[PDB]
């Protein structure tokens, strides 16, 4: 037998499942950004959790330490390239603060809506999950993504499928051919 392909779960469930404060507040996010499940929210809060604990572990050691410097600069720069944390607070103490809202803002589901063109966030999600849109030459079909700052200006419709160009589609084929042209025998 060969070595195992390693794995570990990304979502992390809450402790108290029925709570009035959490259920009401978390569902608003889901309604605004258009998240299908609570699992996605929990995933985002798990990544965020990992970042937080890492930052705490960096901060327990002294300043001007080899471990604290390097890791801090790379963590911070990772959080900058994705665009969650802006340029003003690049201090390592600020990454402890942060919030889930910023993370969901940085998802490609809503970055199409924040650009515009897709009207509603739900519509944008539909566009993404139905093979439309692209980061550059590379096509993307997944709502969750994290756009990497430089990628922002290159987001547009893909060459394949309409809006960008190419053929019309199925419904339009049926309207143009099976209905409109087929009237004349």
């Amino acid at each position: 037998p060969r070595a195992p392909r390693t794995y570990s779960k990304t979502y992390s469930t809450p402790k108290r499942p029925y709570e009035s404060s959490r259920l009401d507040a978390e569902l608003k996010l889901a309604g605004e950004f258009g998240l299908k499940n609570k699992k996605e929210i929990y995933r985002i809060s798990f990544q965020l959790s990992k970042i937080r604990r890492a930052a705490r572990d960096l901060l327990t050691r002294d300043e001007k330490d080899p471990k604290r410097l390097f890791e801090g600069n790379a963590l911070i720069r990772r959080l900058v390239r994705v665009g969650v944390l802006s340029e003003d607070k690049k201090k390592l103490d600020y990454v402890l603060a942060l919030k889930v809202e910023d993370f969901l803002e940085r998802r490609l589901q809503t970055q199409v809506y924040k650009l515009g063109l897709a009207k509603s966030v739900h519509h944008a999600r539909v566009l993404i999950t139905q093979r439309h849109i692209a980061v550059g030459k590379q096509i993307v079909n997944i709502p969750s993504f994290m756009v990497r700052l430089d990628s922002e200006k290159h987001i547009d419709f893909a060459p394949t499928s309409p809006f960008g160009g190419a053929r019309p589609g199925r419904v339009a084929r049926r309207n143009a051919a099976r209905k409109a042209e087929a009237s004349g025998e």
Binding site: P1, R2, A3, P66, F70, N73
Partner: protein
């Protein structure tokens, strides 16, 4: 378990062959050879993974079986032959020559060498005793015994070997003021000339070493192996020069300065 182990899995083999976890269960066990199992590097590993010439084992065998390539300027047709530290891999592919020397991270880089350097190699003398009929002899790290040596050559010293002939062209004594490479373990693939030696009765002579930046350290003498005189190394060193940069200098040079 009832005799020698012929098979060898991935994972059990050393980390410094850069063997990917997947794309196979097993690894090439190095054949019984000059060098040890864990330190050395198979020829297959040197071909398909490092140099990228061959893809499969098939291709490697087809390259080796037509002579062409040769360790120590000798046929060497077996697939998993242990090419270890400081060995000349002579190829007929556009007159290319290769020396196995350690890197910053304790690996075997594709370090090319001149046609003049291909003539000779080095070797750490491990013991010197009388053989039969009172004839003295030395033994290098790769088992290359040399009959009728110079009495100056004592244990722990280096010998320059001529390959074409089993002879001693030169010898270098073991002390400070010499360029001193270091193999084995934590400080593997570094150079710092020796500051001073330490005796310690009952084995293990920890030597003190001081690199060009004066970041001193200590290593065990068994893993220490010298090279040449101060500012005059008898072999051409690779990129890095046996210094070892910290992670800060790495993030300055290897992911900031080098970019377009």
């Amino acid at each position: 378990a009832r005799g020698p182990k012929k098979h060898l899995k991935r994972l059990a083999a050393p980390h410094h062959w850069l063997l990917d976890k997947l794309s196979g269960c097993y690894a090439p066990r190095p054949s019984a050879g000059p060098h040890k199992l864990r330190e050395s590097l198979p020829l297959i590993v040197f071909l398909r993974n490092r140099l990228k010439y061959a893809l499969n084992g098939r291709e490697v065998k087809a390259i080796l079986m037509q002579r062409h390539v040769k360790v120590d300027g000798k046929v060497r047709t077996d697939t998993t032959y242990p090419a270890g530290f400081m060995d000349v891999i002579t190829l007929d592919a556009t007159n290319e020559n290769f020396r196995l020397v350690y890197d910053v991270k304790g690996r075997f880089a594709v370090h090319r060498i001149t046609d003049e350097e291909a003539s000779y190699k080095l070797g750490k003398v491990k013991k010197v005793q009388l053989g039969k009929k009172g004839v003295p002899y030395v033994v290098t790290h790769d088992g290359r015994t040399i009959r009728y040596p110079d009495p100056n050559i004592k244990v722990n010293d280096t010998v320059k070997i001529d390959l074409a002939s089993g002879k001693i062209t030169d010898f270098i004594k073991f002390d400070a003021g010499k360029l001193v490479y270091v193999t084995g373990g934590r400080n593997l693939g570094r150079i710092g000339t020796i500051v001073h030696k330490e005796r310690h009765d009952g084995g293990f002579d920890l030597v003190h070493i001081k690199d060009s930046l004066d970041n001193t350290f200590v290593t065990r003498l068994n893993n220490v192996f010298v090279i040449g005189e101060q500012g005059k190394p008898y072999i051409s060193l690779p990129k890095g020069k046996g210094i070892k940069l910290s992670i800060a200098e790495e993030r300055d040079r290897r992911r900031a300065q080098q970019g377009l």
